[PDB]
Amino acid sequence: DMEMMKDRFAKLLLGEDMSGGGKGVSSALALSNAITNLAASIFGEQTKLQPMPQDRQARWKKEIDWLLSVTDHIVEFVPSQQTSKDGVCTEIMVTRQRGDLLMNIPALRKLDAMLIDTLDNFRGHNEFWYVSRDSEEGQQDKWWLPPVKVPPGGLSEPSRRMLYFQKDSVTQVQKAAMAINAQVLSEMEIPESYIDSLPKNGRASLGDSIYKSITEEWFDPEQFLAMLDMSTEHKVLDLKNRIEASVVIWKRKRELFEERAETILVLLKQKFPGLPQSSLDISKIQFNKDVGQAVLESYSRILESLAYTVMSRIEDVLYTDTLALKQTL
Amino acid sequence: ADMEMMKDRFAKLLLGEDMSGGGKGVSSALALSNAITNLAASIFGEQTKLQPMPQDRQARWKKEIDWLLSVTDHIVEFVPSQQTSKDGVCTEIMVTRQRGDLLMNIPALRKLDAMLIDTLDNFRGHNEFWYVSRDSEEGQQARKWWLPPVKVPPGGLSEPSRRMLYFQKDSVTQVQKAAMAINAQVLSEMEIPESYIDSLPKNGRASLGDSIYKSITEEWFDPEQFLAMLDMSTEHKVLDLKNRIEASVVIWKRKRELFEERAETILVLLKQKFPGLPQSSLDISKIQFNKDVGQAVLESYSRILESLAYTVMSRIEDVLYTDTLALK
Amino acid sequence: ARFIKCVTVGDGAVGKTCMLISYTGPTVFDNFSANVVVDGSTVNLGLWDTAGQEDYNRLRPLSYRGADVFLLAFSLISKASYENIHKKWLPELKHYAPGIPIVLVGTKLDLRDDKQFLKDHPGAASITTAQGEELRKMIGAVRYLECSSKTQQNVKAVFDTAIRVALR
Amino acid sequence: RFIKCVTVGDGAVGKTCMLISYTGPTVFDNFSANVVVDGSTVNLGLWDTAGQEDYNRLRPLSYRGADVFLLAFSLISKASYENIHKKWLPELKHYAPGIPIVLVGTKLDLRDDKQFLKDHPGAASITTAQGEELRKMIGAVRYLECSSKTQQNVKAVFDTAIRVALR
């Protein structure tokens, strides 16, 4: 709580550059990574659907507080008034937490607590259990996870009941987080290095046939997508990046094609709520210097992925239950 | 208590002083460098008497400087090495060890620090000299107005007291030199910033110029007489000279070695003749644009230690000066 | 999109640090910068203390470089601090920053007409607004304000004007 | 000069332990230090990918501006071996084709441990020859077998990454 905190904070001022040359990254990028890395270490041990063991919980509670606590000091410096008991009104400047931090950080802490809460509902005895990956019973996707086993002939209905209930709870948590993430990302500045990577114009970025489709007389984003090869997640990714590239260009008449493209973007989000982040997203995070947004984005990201771990770990039990029932009726 | 205060301090550092959090702040080096100076100012502003540092403030000082210095425990060299197992197998590994320039200077300075607090601590207990409120009645009999007047006995100090006071003054001036050297050294290792180089005039003569440049480049040379040839009656004038010569050195160290040596011997005498003369343009420019955290901590820590030394030195001298007056 | 360096300079026991801490929040004033909206404008403000430099000058080598405005401060209850403005400080600014605006601030306004304080502190002696204004015209400061960290009177006015003059 | 080096591969392969090993509760923060290579000094930036295997959206920066990748599988997990070609190669070849790969086989201390393999029947030892087939298959620049416990070839790994990323 001294020699422990000290290290973490100091490693951050070096900005990753342990030579001390300050050829490191921004204080923001250093914070984004620190959070990412911490969540991976803690969440990586959550391989079973059971409460997070008391000390891992303590580590998590306190470490993240350290990292999140920089946001307490990010302020708006605004004019206000005050009035003494004597009666006099004097003008002062005053300090309030920044707009996008006031509501969002506590929202994310609520989400954090909701997930730790949901794992806690598996305290003690559950009807499902886990086996060693490398035992005999273990050999009976992500191979590193202890195979889950379920009573032969199904799971008690009150057990299945709570499973479905927490999964919905977690799925609403995952969405909540993703919304905040998406929100931070939209407000992060477009890096100078991205605009430079951009092609000369729309057609070049969109490609010949795509550009002709988005510029036809009539346009239907539903027909459009059906026409294209969306078979692999890499392909949707490439399209999203191409469209995104256009929108950036155009936003510098052409508003129709511009509105048309943003219609597709929304559809891409709706038909593919799970996509990895676009070139632009990556670029924004890569170069962002705003430490407030740095924290909002990575915190929302790890929470999204904790939420996913739990959704994943629930879905295992359920799938496993289902298989054991299908072994009869 | 020391979570709330500590985290707090490290935060505003991550923020590069830019409290709007938009990252348009200042390098980590400079933030730290400022933090070190601001704290010292704050702590030794009140330490205005020649007496032990109020035990609490002393603990504040120890822990607070301890926090800012900790970055240096993590600044490393990453060097090839070896290790042999309990079975004689030799494995080639990579080792971390503290960066050269910090491994010796951080404890050097920490030591100078304790040496200064210790010097104040020797004044634990009763002293022959005493202090009087600046705006009271006994303080009105006194001809840096904010320091409480010092007073000494009618007949003047004992020889033992006046002796200890001299002994401490010597001791303290040694620390001031030790710090001044560490400061001057790290400053000579810091990168010359691009903006500085864009301000440099075309030629050696262009910086000096015509008159002074002739002098330096002559057949014979005497550094004392070189200074005696010049008007050195004010800080500004000496300082403008130091700037003139350092500009020329950078010009030369960039192109001749004889003039480069003569110039360096002039800067060397300038340290002897006018110690306590301000940082040069080049110095200030270095500190402004320095990204190196290690060096930032090295330069500021030495700087404030040098200045606490001067303070204690001045405290002693005010006693020895009023002792002089009490005899005469 | 326009940065302002605002350095406040003066003697000891004049309460620079205090004025600064009062404006923002022993006590430290750390180099503090923050976006401030002044007269519809969205300026980037950065405030420097000079505490301790009045003792050792070599302590703060970044005090004058890149300055945009100065707050020259003297204590309305110290005549020496008033004398030092033009004898000691004005020469420093005329040399290291020719042409940058100075705002003359007379601190400790709550104490100036304090009958009991001036009674139990014979050495303290109050300075008049007229006398403060005379100093302004003499050192050529753009404005003169008397303020107080205890009450915060005109403190916010000190900086509002500083920023306004810093800008062109 | 600046090098970004990224360790990629499955879970329970020892990614993080390898890095903690090389440099110095398993936590590896992004690390950067000066190293001298055959004359001049380069700045080495090491990246952990821990957790990505579980949820891809966790680590958006993993592949960007990478100079060299260390593809790692466990010598006692055939699934981790299969995934190098089934799962990880398609990713690097999508986000960063033409960035050099170094095949790393971890848990070298456990590979011929007759006792351990008997105790964990599910675990299965990959031979060097088998790792070389895998090297030539994914077009890796070099195949190395190492151990975090022992420290064998760990420096050889990063020495290779360093050298190959400056071609």
From Swiss-Prot, chain A:
Coiled coil: none annotated. Expressed in pollen grains and pollen tubes. It is found in: Cell membrane. One of its GO terms (molecular function) is guanyl-nucleotide exchange factor activity. It comes from the Eukaryota. Changing residue 304 to A: Decreases GEF activity 20-fold. Changing residue 91 to A: Decreases GEF activity 25-fold. GO terms for cellular component: plasma membrane. Residues 1-329 form the PRONE domain. The PRONE (plant-specific Rop nucleotide exchanger) domain is responsible for the GEF activity. Guanine-nucleotide exchange factor (GEF) that acts as an activator of Rop (Rho of plants) GTPases by promoting the exchange of GDP for GTP. Active as homodimer. Homodimer. The homodimer interacts with ARAC5/ROP4. Interacts with ARAC11/ROP1 and ARAC10/ROP11. Interacts with PRK6. This is Rho guanine nucleotide exchange factor 8. The gene is ROPGEF8. The chain holds residues 85 to 438 of 523 of the full protein.
Swiss-Prot record, chain D:
GTP binds at residues 9-16, 48-52, 106-109. GO terms for biological process: small GTPase-mediated signal transduction. It is a peripheral membrane protein. GO terms for cellular component: cytoplasm; plasma membrane. The gene is ARAC2. Expressed exclusively in the root, hypocotyl and stem. This is Rac-like GTP-binding protein ARAC2. GO terms for molecular function: GTP binding; GTPase activity. Inactive GDP-bound Rho GTPases reside in the cytosol, are found in a complex with Rho GDP-dissociation inhibitors (Rho GDIs), and are released from the GDI protein in order to translocate to membranes upon activation. Its main location: cytoplasm. SUPFAM superfamilies: P-loop containing nucleoside triphosphate hydrolases. A motif (Effector region) lies at residues 25-31. It is found in: Cytoplasm; Membrane. PANTHER family: RHO FAMILY GTPASE. Keywords: Cytoplasm, GTP-binding, Lipoprotein, Membrane, Methylation, Nucleotide-binding, Prenylation. Belongs to the small GTPase superfamily. Rho family.
